[PDB]
Assembly symmetry: C10
Homo-oligomer: 75 residues x 10
């Protein structure tokens, strides 16, 4: 049971690597929001909800990674 | 038995790394949606369904990773 | 047998990493479809089949990764 | 117990890798802000809060990594 | 020979990582095809064979990865 | 306690990987500063403080990585 | 001897990772060819040999990886 | 002591990975300098100092990686 | 001396990872050659030698990786 | 002694990974040089020295990696 515990803790740390995807992705979505509004200010109210949706869906991939991390840590 | 359980848990952690691809990919699709709408607002109803399609197909790759993760954790 | 089984499960997890390629690639294809359509709406029926071909070929690289994962998991 | 402790320390190191996402992502948001403002200075006051929101959400992904790190360390 | 069989299985999993290159590359080619056709529809018949060639060559890098994987699994 | 000291040292090495994010990110910010100033020299005094802020925030992610590294080395 | 053999097989797998560079790089060259030809069709005959040279040199880096793989396997 | 020494040397090698960040980042800065100068030669004396600042800050992230490497090698 | 031999062979394989840098980099240089000539055909004789120099310098990083690989394999 | 030598050799292999950053970075600089000259041939003598500077500074990061590699291999 020492080796299995050890494996849970190493696995937990490994499971956070994938959060780099949401880190970069969320930024990509907001960068597009900024560039799109700068080029066409009147489009703000249209694309802002699209940026929020894009953020949420990219963020979810990070949520799945952290869930596994917490399952290994505590579950 | 200790060695096998340990391996399953390390394996489950490793299995989440691939989710970074969907994290970035989902964002790439939404960035294109936002930049496309900003450049040509009249195209919104045409490209929005393409963004949903793209997100879903990109998300599927992350779901396959999570499937293996859960099979290792629980199966 | 314990060490061999352990290696199968670690290998199965490692085998999912490559799916990040399709996660990003599927999105790159759909981003191009969206931007091409935004710039030239009249071309949509011509490029849509190209995007479907492109995403399918990109996805298949990840499915081969998953194939090896399942062979390791269940073989 | 020494094997478990060893693993916590290895795991704590591994858990910082994901911070590279925030490092890059924060910069992506600021690059868009700078280029957007350069192209259309009048839009600055509109896009700056969008930049604040974007970098904060990108940064938080890294804070989640660090939280697992600190859990393993302490 | 627990050790050698274990190594074949871990090696086979690792051998699939490289497939991410074809996943992204195939997409890059098709993205260019889509963007090139949208900007200049008359060029379609010229660039489409170029995109098939690009796909095949990128794909070949993933084929080699899978070849080593199967040699480790079955060879 | 060969094992625990060894783990602190391997962990400390691994903890520096994340610094690559600030390496790339800091550069991305300064690239935008340079391109923005070249395209619109009159905007320099506006965007320069933005680039300093961007650098600091990206840099902070590398600081956290180094903090964990030093905690593992000396803490 | 079993430990050495094990290592050769692990090493052979590791040696294919670098092929991802060629996978991406071959595609980068073809993307430029397609976009260059789309923008200026008259240039096709000039840039096509440049594309052949570029992808071949990119591809060779992957062949070097595979050579080490095969050395370890056989 | 053998295992601790072994871990120092493996750690020292791992500690160099992060230098890839500065390798790419230094180049991103200089690419921006070149393109900004090509588009607006008159701006060169203004942006050159920015590129030097940018590259130095990017490089330093890699130098911290190298610092940890040497501490592990020679400490 | 079994463990040291084993380490040489694993190290040799690890030392080829860095060749992915030249793979992507060489392509980047040739992509620029192609795009630059397409946009300005008269510049071909000027930029072609620059692409050859760029190729060689990027290629050298791959040479250093393969040298270490061959030193571990045979030296 | 076996364990320490083994570690040095694995370490030396790991130490070359960072060279990928210079491999990509050197190429990014030369691509900018080529695109800059193509857009504005008269700027060649100004930007060529900037490309040499950028390449050398990016290459230095790869040299630091190789330094650690050789110290492990031979020192
Ligand atoms: C996958 C679904 C995601 C939901 C998206 C919802 C989008 C709708 C949209 C309108 C949001 O509500 C939002 C833009 O207003 C929003 O994010 C706010 C709630 C949020 O307060 C935002 C405006 C901020 O100011 C924010 C930067 C906060 O200051 C910061 C402390 C929080 C960062 C953060 O990442 O929080 C997460 C995030 C919201 C995520 C987002 C989850 O949720 C939290 C709580 C639940 C779990 C723990 C997740 C885990 C994480 C790894 O995904 O973290 C939650 C802890
Ligand atoms: C190809 C499969 C994917 C399906 C895509 C379908 C696209 C159609 C499109 C119309 C969607 O339904 C959508 C845009 O309306 C949509 O995502 C809604 C369901 C959703 O309510 C949306 C509007 C949101 O508000 C959404 C951002 C939520 O706030 C947020 C909490 C959900 C994030 C998320 O990633 O959800 C996933 C996703 C839908 C994924 C979707 C998977 O499903 C969930 C629930 C089921 C299981 C648990 C999956 C596992 C995952 C790893 O694939 O996760 C599920 C957990
Ligand atoms: C390096 C050689 C590559 C060949 C390229 C040939 C290009 C010519 C071009 C005209 C093709 O024939 C094509 C575009 O028409 C084509 O690919 C068709 C065969 C294909 O049917 C296409 C129209 C599709 O619709 C396709 C998306 C299929 O629906 C889908 C089920 C197949 C995806 C796929 O990746 O298949 C691969 C691929 C063709 C690859 C292609 C390999 O082949 C398969 C079978 C052989 C091995 C197992 C490879 C492994 C892969 C990882 O390289 O996978 C083969 C299994
Ligand atoms: C998260 C907070 C960051 C602070 C940002 C502050 C921004 C304000 C801005 C006006 C700065 O002060 C600055 C641009 O003037 C500036 O950085 C100067 C201090 C600096 O002297 C600058 C002009 C330089 O010329 C600089 C390139 C130096 O010549 C060079 C030797 C230092 C590089 C470097 O990375 O230093 C770091 C950095 C400032 C970082 C910056 C950290 O600080 C140092 C010391 C503290 C720790 C050890 C960090 C670790 C690093 C990995 O984050 O490294 C510190 C060691
Ligand atoms: C770091 C210095 C690099 C030198 C660059 C020189 C540039 C000058 C320029 C005029 C060249 O000579 C060139 C463009 O004409 C050129 O590369 C030719 C020699 C080359 O034949 C080219 C035109 C091809 O047709 C080429 C695609 C061949 O068909 C292909 C079989 C060779 C691929 C290859 O990567 O070869 C390498 C390369 C030249 C590399 C290039 C080495 O050299 C070889 C032989 C020496 C060692 C073994 C290297 C190791 C490699 C990992 O760097 O591989 C050598 C084995
Ligand atoms: C900041 C340090 C870097 C120095 C940059 C200097 C730039 C100035 C600029 C004018 C150069 O000298 C140069 C462009 O003229 C140049 O590279 C020449 C020396 C070179 O002859 C050039 C014209 C070439 O033809 C060159 C492409 C050769 O064909 C090719 C065989 C060399 C590739 C190469 O990477 O060389 C390196 C590099 C110069 C590196 C340069 C390192 O040096 C070599 C020899 C010395 C040691 C062994 C280093 C180790 C490396 C890991 O840093 O490798 C050396 C092995």
């Amino acid at each position: 049971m020492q080796l299995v515990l050890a494996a849970k803790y190493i696995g937990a740390g490994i499971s956070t690597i994938g959060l780099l995807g949401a880190g970069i992705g969320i930024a990509i979505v907001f960068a597009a929001l900024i560039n799109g509004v700068s080029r066409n200010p009147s489009i703000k109210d249209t694309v802002f909800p699209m940026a929020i949706l894009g953020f949420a869906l990219s963020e979810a991939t990070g949520l799945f990674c952290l869930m596994v991390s917490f399952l290994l840590l505590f579950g």
